[PDB]
Ligand binder design. Sequence first.
Ligand SMILES: OC[C@@H](O)[C@@H](O)[C@H](O)[C@@H](O)CO
Ligand SMILES: OC[C@@H](O)[C@@H](O)[C@H](O)[C@@H](O)CO
Ligand SMILES: OC[C@@H](O)[C@@H](O)[C@H](O)[C@@H](O)CO
Ligand SMILES: OC[C@@H](O)[C@@H](O)[C@H](O)[C@@H](O)CO
Ligand SMILES: [Mg+2]
Ligand SMILES: [Mg+2]
Ligand SMILES: [Mg+2]
Ligand SMILES: [Mg+2]
Lengths: 392, 392, 392, 392
Amino acid sequence: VQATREDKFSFGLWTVGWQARDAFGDATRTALDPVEAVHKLAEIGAYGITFHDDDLVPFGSDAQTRDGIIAGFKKALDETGLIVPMVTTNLFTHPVFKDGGFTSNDRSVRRYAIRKVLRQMDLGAELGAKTLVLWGGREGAEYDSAKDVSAALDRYREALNLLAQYSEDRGYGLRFAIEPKPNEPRGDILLPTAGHAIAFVQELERPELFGINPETGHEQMSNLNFTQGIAQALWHKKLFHIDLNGQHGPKFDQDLVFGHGDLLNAFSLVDLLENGPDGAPAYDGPRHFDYKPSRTEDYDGVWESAKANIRMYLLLKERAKAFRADPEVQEALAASKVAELKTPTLNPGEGYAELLADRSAFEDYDADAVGAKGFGFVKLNQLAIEHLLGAR
Amino acid sequence: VQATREDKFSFGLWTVGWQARDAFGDATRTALDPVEAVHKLAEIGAYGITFHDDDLVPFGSDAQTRDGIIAGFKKALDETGLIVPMVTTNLFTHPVFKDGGFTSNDRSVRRYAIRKVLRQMDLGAELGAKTLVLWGGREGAEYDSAKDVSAALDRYREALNLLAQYSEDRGYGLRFAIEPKPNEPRGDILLPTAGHAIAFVQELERPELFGINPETGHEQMSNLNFTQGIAQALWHKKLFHIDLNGQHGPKFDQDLVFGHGDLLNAFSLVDLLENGPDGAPAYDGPRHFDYKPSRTEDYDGVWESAKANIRMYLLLKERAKAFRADPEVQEALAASKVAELKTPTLNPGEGYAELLADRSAFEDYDADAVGAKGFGFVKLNQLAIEHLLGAR
Amino acid sequence: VQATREDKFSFGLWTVGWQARDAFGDATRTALDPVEAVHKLAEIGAYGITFHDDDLVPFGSDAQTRDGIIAGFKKALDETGLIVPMVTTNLFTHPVFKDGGFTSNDRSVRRYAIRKVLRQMDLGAELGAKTLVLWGGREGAEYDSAKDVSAALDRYREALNLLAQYSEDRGYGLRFAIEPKPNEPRGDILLPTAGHAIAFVQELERPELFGINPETGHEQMSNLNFTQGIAQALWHKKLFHIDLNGQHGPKFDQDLVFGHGDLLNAFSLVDLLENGPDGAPAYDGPRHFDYKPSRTEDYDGVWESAKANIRMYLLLKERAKAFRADPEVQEALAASKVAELKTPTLNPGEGYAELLADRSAFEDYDADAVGAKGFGFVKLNQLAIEHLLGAR
Amino acid sequence: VQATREDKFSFGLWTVGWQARDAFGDATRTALDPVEAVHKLAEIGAYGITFHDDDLVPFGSDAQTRDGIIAGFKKALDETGLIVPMVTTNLFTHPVFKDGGFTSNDRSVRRYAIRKVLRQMDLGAELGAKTLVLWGGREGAEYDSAKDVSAALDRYREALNLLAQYSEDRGYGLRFAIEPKPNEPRGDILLPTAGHAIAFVQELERPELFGINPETGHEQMSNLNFTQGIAQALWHKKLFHIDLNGQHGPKFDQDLVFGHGDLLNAFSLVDLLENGPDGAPAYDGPRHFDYKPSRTEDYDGVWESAKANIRMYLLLKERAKAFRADPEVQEALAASKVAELKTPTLNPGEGYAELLADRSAFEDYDADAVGAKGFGFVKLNQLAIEHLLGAR
Ligand SMILES: OC[C@@H](O)[C@@H](O)[C@H](O)[C@@H](O)CO
Ligand SMILES: OC[C@@H](O)[C@@H](O)[C@H](O)[C@@H](O)CO
Ligand SMILES: OC[C@@H](O)[C@@H](O)[C@H](O)[C@@H](O)CO
Ligand SMILES: OC[C@@H](O)[C@@H](O)[C@H](O)[C@@H](O)CO
Ligand SMILES: [Mg+2]
Ligand SMILES: [Mg+2]
Ligand SMILES: [Mg+2]
Ligand SMILES: [Mg+2]
């Protein structure tokens, strides 16, 4: 299988660039030059790169340095044909953000966090980025009495509303994507799941400019079904971006290669994004890999792992396609009545009164007889895995 | 401390009435008579009782029978002074609901599911109930290819829009509270967390009529912070009802007495609900205990466990109040800047243009200096714990 | 592929016979006749059947009735050529066992539990069973003060020593396998993981007669690595039996078909068992499926699901074989140094004296240079999954 | 209350010295001077201090330096009266240990790891330490095909056997305590639970010299009942040491103050360790706090947090004693038959022959009447909690 720009695979500079300094040890790899990252990624088949302001320009660089770095980065994209579909801001690393950016209890930190972001929005706009991703990693708490969640939500909203105002006024045309995470690094992070993030966005001033950027491992950290969660994000039309990676349930954030965690869910996810209505994908944005090359690898291991992500996604797509094209699958789908859920429960123009008058919907209904027919779901599931396994 | 009608403790008929038949064993208790339950609940301090249709009137009772039970039931209510704040429908027990009620792949079960609920709405209306709780326990799947999540949400919405229509035409004045649960009985249930339920509700035709009924244990089954999710629900103004109980993290649904599982989170929850805005509670609805007397107990144990629920709440309330009234806590709160979060990040009339002009919010900001001061959150947490243990 | 008797696939009478009454609903299937179950299993390729005393002979059957059932059973066995490799006793269903069998706080229940088991050993011995599995599903607690664990382990050991005694005296030649489970039905079950069971077994009077019967989902309920725990059980030589099924991390006991939960862990499990040292399997007992046909299925889904367990094992087996015979996989193994772990760390005859004397082990050790070499683990993982996917 | 040296509260140098560099951000605190630490801890009530080789002497310190540091360290101990009850070695930080120390695939690393430990054993012996704690934080894997678990256990055994040998020959008199942890930093760590660790120890050459050092948060990361695990560890006589802290279930290793995570389980643990048989504590070793002052804190929060660990243990101790001394508790314990578990199931001199001859244990036993009586566990639990809240 081969990756095309139409596949839209993107990588964050902080992914292949992760030096592997974890909570219990020192870095095992040297620093990756952004320019080299651009050439390597272009080479393995990626169509775009993303970055945190501090990933490209070292926190605290003068404008001379800053400017110089942007210029070279810009050349590299130029020469390679890579685009920057999204940019983000680092509101978690520096000690000042120890209690959050936008929701720090310290008012001065909150004003500073907004400024840091406006600036990144400027660069984003100049590089042609269309989405600003906001990961509130430090927004939350370790102790219940330390954070007033209501006030917190008011301040998160306040900051976001200003950001959309600016973008709209400067005409940047950006879309905002809130990234939910349940915990790590805070004991508990605000807006813990795709559901909480979606509900919150619905309360902003210009909600149409906001969506979510859910990450595979983030929902799996709470043992939730990532595919089902994405399906709901799609139903709401808030899937603005997506971070793909692997995780093995509730434990620290693993950030494994996509499909190296819950493989069955990785399969159902590709199927959902790709086998959309009418052949066409159900999702159109970047297929972004927010993962980390294991601490035990060297740069060889690093590039290997970058390609494994693309590879996993294309192998899965291929099997998802074959699955759906299989007449035996088509027959099992029919037997399990999966498409019957698409037919409205009520007849055309039928209301409460017509339903109340329908004796077959209750008075004359044989629940015991209907309760005994099987749905044939194990069989359909078995067909799916055989396709995944390449046994069909 | 003793319970008042003002405390608003309510219990489901099915809590104290649970025969303790579990997934691996026979019932260890005999059936509890409803008139009896009303009488015993009235005696321990409950102000109201709730029930699923099938808890009161056995599935399939002829009208004479059904009519007879209701009459007896109403008389018990009458005599004890107990009310029916909420009613619900059993859409999970009968085999016909094995793939869901509103979102079953089978269209006829969907139609019957609506009829069974309309009928319950009429009785609830008749008893004076103000809330209809909907727990979609059979909505979800075991395998991803078995359920079209999108179609399932359309059908969940189609059914609720109809229920609101009927309630409104008829003048019943009901409020609808959706109850989220991540799993059990289904592998994965649709609308798994408080967030997912709130996001969904915002998409119905008359959203103002819809809220959620979150359960302590359900959020804990995903290892989420229950108090923090209630804080967000209150922020959205969607906390229409609450189900209190205890649980020990992610494992089957335990349904312990409130406060017998995560005690620290039980404490922060009572503080949130009672030490509200003015001085006044932040939540005014029923404090409903959705628990189960452990299988190892007889009826003395059942009545002991019912009183334990009320005792845990009043004991926690008492300490929450004491916590907030302590000068040392006030001092700790001031050092942690909890209240500073309530002050807008921006000065009145300040926008991005003024923020951008403030050199001190960025260009001259000493982030290193700010990042070095502590928040003193451990100390605040320790004071809270000492109040809970009655150590101060 | 097709299963052979050499495959040693067995099923418990209670798996295909599960009537699907869960914690929230009635049964969706009628009862399966044991003779019929014998015939059907034989037909799908099983080599044996197992059962709890109460699965075959209804609790409280008079001796004439019990004798009759046993006789018809034996005939079916005879006629089909199926064997009974293991038997077990139900010490969890009847209300009497609500606080456990061997470890109930009530002395009389402990005496009756032992008699119930002795009677099953007789029947097992007569059907030719070689293993007696002990699943103490009710041994545990919901509250810490309710159970003295130390006393409980003493009582557990007391019962198990008597059982070995009787067996050895009767010349039954049985081996005992304790089956660990973390929770469900008790809040916390004693001997929660394979580890705890092994450590306990080591304290019996005749440890050589005791091992464990670990179950895939049971270890996954604690989010532990099943294959890795199995590897350790094999190092201790205590894998007497195994229960294969599927689970999705920490939540109620799902009992899915083997391979329908954690697919990647199912794959590495089959690699461990069959591609043992010296060509041959590392384990030679029954491959027992302790699963449940989903509640959504009828008898067709039931047989479908029994066959899916066998297909799943055979497909993974084929892929594990191909994986290991791949010269590229071999080269990756060499590069990752997997086999180098099998070489003693100390040289032959080397002791601490010589090690202390070797300056290349410390004094002249270049930690920094070794620390920089990659192990190539990601690439190895990628070939593994490419084999499972049938992409190689 | 006040801490005495008989309480035996000890702390690791890395606890109060944690600079708060997490997986996502920089250190928020400057480095702690070891002499100061000795002084500070002496002041809050600690009776001893512990450390990893590398906590005290910077990795790669010349002999001169090393010697220099130790000498100052011994002075501080001298001056203050603190002892070093236990010592440990860092086999997780330096990049060379990325695949483990003792079970690294790389043989040269295994040799180096051994050397590094020998050296710390010497320093330990010289400082008067009685226990060597071994935490194999890097022992495990991220991918199943990368680690032969059996060979890894062989190599782990091989290294421990040698250490015992050396200690015995040098006459050091050390006991060794293996510390289990399920994950972090490796995806899966070898010897994931107290269970697994005990089973392993039993396979060593001089098992009487080995035990375990379970940590509260480690067992809670897999959602196990810490108290029950320590009860088993005491049953086996393998509780050589204990690490006390707090955790909020399955998520990253939090390291909160003891009792700041699962408060009810911290209560039952204190009760188990102190309200041992013959009035006396069931455990007589160090009560060691392996925790971390939250990243949001400064040095004041650091000493605050140190004192909190002591305050929590002593407040809990005080309630555990009141609980056991309460007559109504005594009445509840009797009704729950907690002590009847201590009376052997069989009468003195009874074996299977006499048990078989007892019609009352089976043939004439009324399981139904026994099964109808409740154990009063809920009431007993409620009394325990009211004692903890200081409500009784
Ligand atoms: O768990 C960390 C998180 O995934 C981070 O990598 C974000 O995705 C980023 O800050 C915005 O893309
Ligand atoms: O998981 C059980 C669930 O909590 C159920 O008891 C609902 O709460 C009820 O059907 C609506 O109140
Ligand atoms: O969770 C239930 C457990 O798995 C049970 O099915 C045992 O396996 C059996 O009683 C002994 O084989
Ligand atoms: O998870 C970290 C681990 O607990 C470490 O702090 C050890 O306990 C130490 O290596 C020996 O005490
Ligand atoms: Mg991400
Ligand atoms: Mg509920
Ligand atoms: Mg089993
Ligand atoms: Mg520790």
